Amino acid sequence: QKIFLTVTADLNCNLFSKEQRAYITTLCPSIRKMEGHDGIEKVCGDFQDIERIHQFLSEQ
Amino acid sequence: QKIFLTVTADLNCNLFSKEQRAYITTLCPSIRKMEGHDGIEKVCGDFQDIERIHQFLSEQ
Amino acid sequence: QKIFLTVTADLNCNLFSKEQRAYITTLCPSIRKMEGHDGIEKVCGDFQDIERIHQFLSEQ
Amino acid sequence: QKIFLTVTADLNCNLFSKEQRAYITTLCPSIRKMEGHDGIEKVCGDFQDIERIHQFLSEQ
Protein backbone atom coordinates (compact mmCIF):
# COMPACT_ATOMS: atom_id res chain seq x y z
CA GLN A 1 0.00 0.00 0.00
CA LYS A 2 1.28 3.56 0.91
CA ILE A 3 4.12 4.39 3.39
CA PHE A 4 2.58 7.87 4.17
CA LEU A 5 -1.29 7.75 4.06
CA THR A 6 -1.04 11.53 3.40
CA VAL A 7 1.55 14.36 3.65
CA THR A 8 0.83 18.06 4.32
CA ALA A 9 3.31 20.95 3.75
CA ASP A 10 3.01 24.57 4.98
CA LEU A 11 4.27 26.65 2.01
CA ASN A 12 6.49 29.72 2.57
CA CYS A 13 4.13 32.54 1.37
CA ASN A 14 6.84 35.23 2.06
CA LEU A 15 9.25 33.55 -0.39
CA PHE A 16 6.78 32.75 -3.22
CA SER A 17 3.96 34.81 -4.80
CA LYS A 18 0.27 33.87 -5.21
CA GLU A 19 1.09 33.41 -8.97
CA GLN A 20 4.09 31.05 -8.33
CA ARG A 21 2.21 28.93 -5.74
CA ALA A 22 -0.96 28.92 -7.97
CA TYR A 23 0.91 26.77 -10.57
CA ILE A 24 0.72 23.87 -8.03
CA THR A 25 -2.89 23.28 -9.35
CA THR A 26 -1.40 22.41 -12.84
CA LEU A 27 1.80 20.73 -11.51
CA CYS A 28 -0.23 18.32 -9.19
CA PRO A 29 -3.91 18.42 -10.25
CA SER A 30 -5.27 16.06 -7.48
CA ILE A 31 -3.32 17.82 -4.63
CA ARG A 32 -5.76 19.20 -1.98
CA LYS A 33 -5.02 22.93 -1.22
CA MET A 34 -5.66 25.23 1.78
CA GLU A 35 -6.23 28.58 -0.03
CA GLY A 36 -6.94 32.21 1.01
CA HIS A 37 -7.31 35.55 -0.83
CA ASP A 38 -3.47 35.13 -0.66
CA GLY A 39 -3.68 31.90 -2.81
CA ILE A 40 -2.35 28.42 -1.82
CA GLU A 41 -0.80 28.36 1.70
CA LYS A 42 -0.80 24.54 2.48
CA VAL A 43 -0.95 21.38 0.28
CA CYS A 44 -2.00 17.78 1.13
CA GLY A 45 -1.67 14.47 -0.81
CA ASP A 46 0.81 11.75 -1.98
CA PHE A 47 4.54 12.07 -0.92
CA GLN A 48 5.40 12.05 -4.71
CA ASP A 49 3.36 15.29 -5.21
CA ILE A 50 5.02 16.97 -2.16
CA GLU A 51 8.45 16.07 -3.74
CA ARG A 52 7.30 17.43 -7.18
CA ILE A 53 6.02 20.65 -5.47
CA HIS A 54 9.33 20.99 -3.51
CA GLN A 55 11.33 20.51 -6.81
CA PHE A 56 9.20 23.19 -8.61
CA LEU A 57 9.44 25.91 -5.84
CA SER A 58 13.12 25.03 -5.32
CA GLU A 59 13.76 26.23 -8.97
CA GLN A 60 11.91 29.59 -8.62
CA GLN B 1 14.82 30.42 3.21
CA LYS B 2 12.59 27.35 4.01
CA ILE B 3 10.44 26.19 1.01
CA PHE B 4 8.04 24.23 3.33
CA LEU B 5 7.84 26.00 6.76
CA THR B 6 6.90 22.51 8.14
CA VAL B 7 5.82 19.11 6.73
CA THR B 8 3.62 16.49 8.45
CA ALA B 9 3.23 12.82 7.43
CA ASP B 10 0.51 10.30 8.39
CA LEU B 11 2.42 7.00 8.96
CA ASN B 12 0.66 3.80 7.73
CA CYS B 13 0.49 1.97 11.13
CA ASN B 14 -0.98 -1.19 9.45
CA LEU B 15 2.13 -1.73 7.25
CA PHE B 16 4.73 -0.90 9.99
CA SER B 17 4.97 -2.19 13.63
CA LYS B 18 5.42 0.01 16.76
CA GLU B 19 9.13 -1.14 16.91
CA GLN B 20 9.70 -0.21 13.22
CA ARG B 21 7.97 3.21 13.68
CA ALA B 22 9.69 3.76 17.09
CA TYR B 23 13.16 4.16 15.44
CA ILE B 24 11.98 7.41 13.72
CA THR B 25 12.99 9.36 16.93
CA THR B 26 16.59 7.97 16.71
CA LEU B 27 16.68 8.42 12.87
CA CYS B 28 15.57 12.15 13.23
CA PRO B 29 16.18 13.21 16.85
CA SER B 30 14.63 16.73 16.48
CA ILE B 31 11.40 15.27 14.88
CA ARG B 32 7.98 15.93 16.50
CA LYS B 33 5.49 13.02 16.75
CA MET B 34 1.91 12.02 17.69
CA GLU B 35 1.84 8.73 19.67
CA GLY B 36 -1.12 6.37 20.51
CA HIS B 37 -1.56 2.81 21.97
CA ASP B 38 0.46 1.41 18.93
CA GLY B 39 3.29 4.05 19.14
CA ILE B 40 4.01 6.78 16.51
CA GLU B 41 1.08 7.58 14.10
CA LYS B 42 2.21 11.05 12.81
CA VAL B 43 5.45 13.10 12.50
CA CYS B 44 6.22 16.80 11.76
CA GLY B 45 9.50 18.53 10.74
CA ASP B 46 11.75 19.63 7.82
CA PHE B 47 11.31 18.21 4.29
CA GLN B 48 14.79 16.58 4.76
CA ASP B 49 13.53 14.60 7.84
CA ILE B 50 10.28 13.44 6.12
CA GLU B 51 12.40 12.27 3.11
CA ARG B 52 14.72 10.31 5.49
CA ILE B 53 11.65 8.80 7.29
CA HIS B 54 10.14 7.79 3.87
CA GLN B 55 13.57 6.29 2.81
CA PHE B 56 13.90 4.33 6.15
CA LEU B 57 10.31 2.91 6.10
CA SER B 58 10.65 2.21 2.34
CA GLU B 59 13.54 -0.27 3.13
CA GLN B 60 11.50 -2.39 5.66
CA GLN C 1 -1.69 38.19 21.69
CA LYS C 2 -2.41 34.95 19.69
CA ILE C 3 -3.07 31.89 21.99
CA PHE C 4 -3.57 29.66 18.89
CA LEU C 5 -1.32 30.70 15.93
CA THR C 6 -3.85 28.95 13.63
CA VAL C 7 -6.85 26.63 14.10
CA THR C 8 -8.08 24.07 11.56
CA ALA C 9 -11.53 22.38 11.61
CA ASP C 10 -12.74 19.35 9.62
CA LEU C 11 -16.39 19.99 8.61
CA ASN C 12 -19.12 17.32 8.82
CA CYS C 13 -19.83 17.39 5.05
CA ASN C 14 -22.60 14.73 5.61
CA LEU C 15 -24.52 16.94 8.09
CA PHE C 16 -24.34 20.21 5.98
CA SER C 17 -24.89 20.91 2.21
CA LYS C 18 -22.41 22.62 -0.20
CA GLU C 19 -24.71 25.73 -0.09
CA GLN C 20 -24.64 25.74 3.77
CA ARG C 21 -20.81 25.25 3.97
CA ALA C 22 -20.29 27.79 1.07
CA TYR C 23 -21.42 30.81 3.21
CA ILE C 24 -18.29 30.33 5.42
CA THR C 25 -16.22 32.54 3.00
CA THR C 26 -18.84 35.33 3.36
CA LEU C 27 -19.27 34.74 7.15
CA CYS C 28 -15.41 34.76 7.61
CA PRO C 29 -13.85 36.66 4.63
CA SER C 30 -10.22 36.23 5.93
CA ILE C 31 -10.69 32.40 6.38
CA ARG C 32 -8.61 29.80 4.51
CA LYS C 33 -10.44 26.75 3.06
CA MET C 34 -9.94 23.42 1.22
CA GLU C 35 -12.67 22.61 -1.34
CA GLY C 36 -13.42 19.04 -2.63
CA HIS C 37 -16.20 18.17 -5.17
CA ASP C 38 -19.00 18.86 -2.57
CA GLY C 39 -17.63 22.30 -1.59
CA ILE C 40 -15.63 23.30 1.53
CA GLU C 41 -14.31 20.29 3.57
CA LYS C 42 -11.77 21.98 5.89
CA VAL C 43 -11.27 25.55 7.20
CA CYS C 44 -8.20 27.30 8.76
CA GLY C 45 -8.05 30.67 10.63
CA ASP C 46 -8.37 32.37 14.07
CA PHE C 47 -10.06 30.83 17.13
CA GLN C 48 -12.79 33.57 16.86
CA ASP C 49 -13.35 32.58 13.15
CA ILE C 50 -13.67 28.84 14.02
CA GLU C 51 -16.07 29.82 16.91
CA ARG C 52 -18.37 31.88 14.59
CA ILE C 53 -18.30 28.96 12.06
CA HIS C 54 -19.37 26.45 14.81
CA GLN C 55 -22.21 28.90 15.78
CA PHE C 56 -23.37 29.51 12.14
CA LEU C 57 -23.52 25.75 11.42
CA SER C 58 -25.02 24.76 14.83
CA GLU C 59 -28.16 26.83 13.86
CA GLN C 60 -28.77 25.03 10.50
CA GLN D 1 -23.50 13.66 14.72
CA LYS D 2 -21.10 16.61 15.37
CA ILE D 3 -20.30 19.89 13.46
CA PHE D 4 -16.45 19.59 13.42
CA LEU D 5 -15.09 16.01 12.84
CA THR D 6 -11.75 17.11 14.46
CA VAL D 7 -10.15 20.46 15.32
CA THR D 8 -6.39 21.17 15.42
CA ALA D 9 -4.72 24.20 17.06
CA ASP D 10 -1.11 25.41 16.59
CA LEU D 11 -0.05 26.57 20.08
CA ASN D 12 1.81 29.86 20.65
CA CYS D 13 5.07 28.40 22.13
CA ASN D 14 6.60 31.93 22.48
CA LEU D 15 3.78 33.18 24.78
CA PHE D 16 3.45 29.89 26.83
CA SER D 17 6.36 27.84 28.44
CA LYS D 18 6.85 24.05 27.92
CA GLU D 19 5.41 23.59 31.49
CA GLN D 20 2.25 25.71 31.00
CA ARG D 21 1.69 23.73 27.72
CA ALA D 22 2.40 20.31 29.43
CA TYR D 23 -0.70 20.78 31.72
CA ILE D 24 -2.88 20.10 28.54
CA THR D 25 -2.18 16.35 29.25
CA THR D 26 -4.01 16.73 32.66
CA LEU D 27 -6.64 19.26 31.34
CA CYS D 28 -7.68 16.98 28.36
CA PRO D 29 -6.14 13.48 28.77
CA SER D 30 -7.99 12.53 25.51
CA ILE D 31 -6.35 15.30 23.33
CA ARG D 32 -3.95 13.95 20.61
CA LYS D 33 -0.64 15.93 20.80
CA MET D 34 2.24 16.77 18.39
CA GLU D 35 5.24 16.95 20.78
CA GLY D 36 9.08 17.19 20.73
CA HIS D 37 11.81 18.60 23.05
CA ASP D 38 9.89 21.92 23.59
CA GLY D 39 6.81 19.78 24.48
CA ILE D 40 3.31 20.09 22.95
CA GLU D 41 3.26 22.37 19.85
CA LYS D 42 -0.09 21.36 18.26
CA VAL D 43 -3.27 19.70 19.74
CA CYS D 44 -6.02 17.78 17.81
CA GLY D 45 -9.46 16.67 19.08
CA ASP D 46 -13.07 17.72 19.82
CA PHE D 47 -14.12 21.40 19.53
CA GLN D 48 -15.09 21.31 23.32
CA ASP D 49 -11.50 20.23 24.24
CA ILE D 50 -9.92 22.97 22.02
CA GLU D 51 -12.24 25.50 23.81
CA ARG D 52 -11.12 24.19 27.26
CA ILE D 53 -7.39 24.47 26.32
CA HIS D 54 -7.99 28.04 24.92
CA GLN D 55 -10.01 28.82 28.12
CA PHE D 56 -7.09 27.48 30.32
CA LEU D 57 -4.34 29.26 28.35
CA SER D 58 -6.33 32.55 28.15
CA GLU D 59 -6.68 32.43 32.01
CA GLN D 60 -2.78 32.72 32.13
Residue numbers in the entry:
A (entry chain A), B (entry chain D), C (entry chain B), D (entry chain C): 132 to 191
Text lifted from the article:
Deltex proteins are a family of E3 ubiquitin ligases that encode C‐terminal RING and DTC domains that mediate interactions with E2 ubiquitin‐conjugating enzymes and recognize ubiquitination substrates. DTX3L has a distinctive domain architecture as it substitutes the WWE domains and proline‐rich region with three domains termed D1, D2 and D3. The N‐terminal D1 and D2 domains of DTX3L mediate homo‐oligomerization, and the D3 domain interacts with PARP9, a protein that contains tandem macrodomains with ADP‐ribose reader function. Our results suggest that homo‐oligomerization of DTX3L is important for the DTX3L‐PARP9 complex to read mono‐ADP‐ribosylation on a ligand‐regulated transcription factor.
Using mass‐spectrometry, we identified that the amino acid sequence of the crystallizable fragment started at A126 and ended in Q200. Taking advantage of the presence of methionine and cysteine residues in the protein sequence we solved the structure by sulfur single‐wavelength anomalous diffraction (S‐SAD) using high‐redundancy data collected on the long‐wavelength beamline I23, at Diamond Light Source, UK. Despite the anisotropy, we observe a well‐defined electron density for the protein, for which we determined that the D2 domain comprises three antiparallel β‐sheets packed against two α‐helices. The asymmetric unit of the crystal had four copies of the D2 monomer, and the interfaces buried in this oligomer (973 and 415 Å2) indicate that this could be a biologically relevant oligomer and that D2 assembles as a homo‐tetramer with a 2‐fold symmetry between adjacent dimers. This assembly continues the antiparallel β sheet of the monomer with six hydrogen bonds between the strands. At the main interface there is a hydrophobic cleft that accommodates Ile134 and Phe135 from its complementary chain (left). The smaller interface is formed between the short β2 strands and only two inter‐chain hydrogen bonds are formed. Taking all into account, dimer and tetramer are stable in solution, but the structural features suggest that the dimer might be a more stable assembly.
